[PDB]
């Protein structure tokens, strides 16, 4: 019963570029409420960067409106973050999340030369 | 076939009719053709897909009906939607959900009192303005708001014999956001029909009157069922 | 007259691990009076990690002691630093410096996988 989410993508980019990350899940993603994509920094909590409903509306916070993007894919159960345009704050360690409690392994994501 | 096609995206319209008369369609025909070997047809055009999407989350007696018939006829089980569970949550999952709502401004204090699911699920407005420091109204409105939102998409089966949740559902879906307060008081569907409206309002901290008329008579019809 | 820094070394390790940086300069580094190694982050302003003087007396600041170690090298004129045990946050654009005014033009250090 207990949903296993696994993460995809990650590495190392340059400043400007693209990304995209894959969260894969055991079940069906449309049963599921609403999923959510985290993001930790080192030295620092965690912080939310999207979520998506069952429904399909999407909120994103203010500092990172416009150079990402959520969508979920019904073909394979597989919940996609896309990254247009990258900063070099924006080097963390991604995490998906299910409905709030289950959790993902992580990602390392980081932007130099 | 080809023709089939046709009627697998008719389904996404906004109004009623259209997808009642397409689920009336496909599920007679998938009666038609289920006694006969030929069922891989609904296989190979996907529309098992788009059933077994629509069903979940879905507040329509006639449609959601109609393709629970559709799905069982073919031998398939009917998805159920995959709910949290709120009132088994500590501290962590509060926290994270403040970082999901937006509210993330607060979870310094709502770490410092400790609150979680179950006290998470009980919050009025004056431990809100008092303690936990959300002084303006507007805000206040907002955070109830998100509350609402929650409580009624919510996973009560650890702690809801009688199925409360589903007899509050069948009436108005914005209703079964109230299931929490009827079970930690006490209640159950049994000896439901004989509360007052006076211990509705504090008690099961239903605040609406038009919520309180309405769950009054309908549950005071159902009087002496057993 | 004006002296030239040239610097070398950088690039990318992993969390844990050492770097060398050399600076080269014009002329004999016994001349002059004080050289150093300044850090600037992304996001912040700069700050000092080492400094030597023309007696090789050397200061170092409380963040990186035991971490870091300064030298002169008199044989090819060359100013070396080396950075033994290394964390996350120490990446940022690393300066050589000569005995105030005079600066180089950096290198990126970076640390991840």
């Known amino acids: 019963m207990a949903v296993q989410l696994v993460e995809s993508g990650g590495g190392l980019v340059q400043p400007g570029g693209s990304l995209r990350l894959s969260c894969?899940?055991?079940?069906?993603?449309?049963?599921?409420?609403?999923?959510?994509?985290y993001r930790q920094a080192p030295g620092k909590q965690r912080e939310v960067?999207?979520?998506?409903?069952?429904?399909?509306?999407?909120?994103?916070?203010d500092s990172v409106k416009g150079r990402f993007t959520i969508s979920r894919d019904n073909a394979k159960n597989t919940v996609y973050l896309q990254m247009n345009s990258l900063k070099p704050e924006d080097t963390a360690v991604y995490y998906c999340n299910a409905n709030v409690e289950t959790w993902g392994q992580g990602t390392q994501v980081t932007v130099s030369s | 076939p080809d023709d089939l096609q046709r009627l697998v995206p008719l389904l996404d319209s906004n109004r009623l009719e259209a997808q009642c008369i397409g689920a009336f369609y496909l599920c007679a025909e998938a009666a038609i053709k289920s006694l006969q070997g030929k069922t891989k047809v609904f296989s190979d055009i996907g529309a098992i897909q788009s059933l077994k999407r629509l069903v979940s989350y879905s507040t329509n007696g006639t449609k959601s009906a109609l393709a629970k018939r559709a799905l069982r006829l073919l031998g398939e089980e009917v998805p159920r939607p995959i709910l949290p569970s709120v009132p088994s949550w500590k501290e962590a999952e509060v926290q994270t959900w403040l970082q999901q709502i937006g509210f993330s401004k607060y979870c310094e204090s709502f770490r410092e009192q400790q609150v979680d699911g179950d006290l998470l699920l009980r919050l009025t407005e004056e431990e809100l303005q008092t303690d936990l420091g959300m002084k303006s109204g507007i805000t206040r409105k907002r955070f109830f708001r998100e509350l609402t939102e929650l409580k009624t998409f919510a996973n009560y089966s650890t702690c809801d014999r009688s199925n409360l949740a589903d007899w509050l559902g069948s009436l108005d879906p914005r209703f079964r956001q109230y299931t929490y307060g009827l079970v930690s008081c006490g209640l159950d569907r049994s000896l439901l029909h004989r509360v007052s409206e006076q211990q509705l309002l504090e008690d099961c901290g239903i605040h609406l009157g038009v919520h309180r008329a309405r769950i009054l008579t309908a549950a005071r019809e159902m009087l002496h069922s057993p | 007259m004006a002296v030239q820094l040239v610097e070398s070394g950088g690039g990318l390790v992993q969390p844990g691990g050492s770097l060398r940086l050399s600076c080269a300069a014009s002329?004999?580094?016994?001349?002059?009076?004080?050289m150093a190694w300044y850090r600037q982050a992304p996001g912040k302003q700069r700050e000092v990690v080492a400094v030597?003087?023309?007696?090789?007396?050397?200061n170092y600041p409380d963040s990186v002691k035991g971490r870091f170690t300064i030298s002169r090298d008199n044989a090819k004129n060359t100013v070396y630093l080396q950075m033994n045990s290394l964390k996350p946050e120490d990446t940022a654009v690393y300066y050589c410096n000569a005995n105030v005014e005079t600066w180089g033009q950096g290198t990126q250090v970076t640390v991840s996988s």
């Open positions: 030597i003087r023309y007696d090789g007396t050397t």
């Open positions: 002329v004999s580094i016994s001349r002059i009076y004080v």
